[PDB]
């Protein structure tokens, strides 16, 4: 009541503080809510939705060619089709996703990462893909027999034309840090290495250079703590129409 002593954290401006502040209009009734579709009350509602991974990630791939990986008819078995680093908080193919860009607003993340690959070839293009998420601790597997020891799934294209490799949550800690080092135990996640299983067979009148679009989402076991500023965006200079919103 009347005897009040100021705390050491009094008079400061915390960014994440939640104290109620003063109104400016003393009797402002806002316009009432209408049912706008898609009410978003948590980030997990955006997190578990699929989003294209930048699997190609190569300088010859310009724009549209980056979001797909061109899988071709190989003349020999047991080649690496592609390998995806699963640093969802570091720059990589998982960075330009919903889960990557939104998790880069956080330092600590947890949960299984679903990764759905949709075969965007012809109907007559047949082939089995083996997708192996390898837990961290060793190198990225460039050979299939070193890869299938991890979390591997075998996928025949068929009528469904898409698979979901669910990357499980195997870690010593409850969460994984960002920490700006992809070699760390609490930051390295594993490697999703996709290989030919029984080769991609296309007809001669279908395109040999078939294409695959991969996605990463998560499940409802995902979680995020220690909110931070995302390094995806950055302001080195005051943009256009700033200092023209002041004049």
């Amino acid at each position: 009541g009347v005897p009040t002593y100021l705390l050491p954290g009094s008079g400061q401006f915390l960014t994440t503080d939640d104290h109620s502040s003063a109104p400016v209009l003393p009797c402002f009734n806002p316009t009432p809510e209408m049912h706008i579709p898609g009410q978003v009350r948590n980030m997990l509602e955006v997190i578990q939705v699929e989003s294209m991974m930048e699997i190609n990630n190569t300088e010859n791939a310009v724009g549209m060619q980056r979001l797909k990986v061109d899988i071709s008819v190989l003349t020999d078995v047991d080649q690496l089709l592609f390998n995806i680093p699963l640093d969802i908080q570091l720059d990589g193919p998982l960075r330009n996703t919903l889960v990557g860009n939104i998790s880069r607003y956080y330092t600590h993340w947890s949960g299984s990462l679903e990764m759905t690959f949709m075969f965007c070839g012809s109907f007559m293009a047949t082939g089995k893909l083996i997708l192996c998420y390898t837990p961290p601790g060793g190198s990225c597997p460039t050979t299939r027999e070193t890869a299938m020891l991890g979390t591997h799934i075998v996928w025949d294209f068929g009528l469904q034309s898409s698979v979901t490799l669910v990357i499980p949550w195997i870690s010593g800690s409850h969460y994984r840090m960002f920490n700006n080092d992809a070699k760390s135990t609490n930051a390295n996640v594993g490697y999703v290495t996709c290989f030919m299983q029984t080769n991609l067979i296309v007809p001669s009148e279908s395109s040999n250079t078939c294409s695959l679009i991969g996605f990463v989402a998560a499940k409802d076991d995902f979680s995020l703590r220690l909110m931070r500023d995302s390094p995806d965006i950055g302001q080195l200079e005051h943009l256009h129409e700033a200092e023209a919103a002041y004049q």
């Binding site: 939640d18 104290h19 109620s20 502040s21 003063a22 109104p23 209009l25 003393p26 009797c27 402002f28 806002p30 579709p37 898609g38 009410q39 009350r41 948590n42 997990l44 509602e45 955006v46 578990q48 939705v49 989402a217 409802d220």
Partner: protein, 31 residues
């Protein structure tokens, strides 16, 4: 835990209690 002493409902604390979420709007917008 709320020290909302002002007469406006919009002046209250940031209500970080809306735990209800529906991911099937955006994950499974089918059938």
């Amino acid at each position: 835990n709320q020290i909302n002493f002002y007469k406006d409902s919009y002046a209250a604390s940031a209500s970080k209690q809306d735990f209800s979420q529906d991911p099937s709007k955006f994950t499974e917008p089918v059938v």
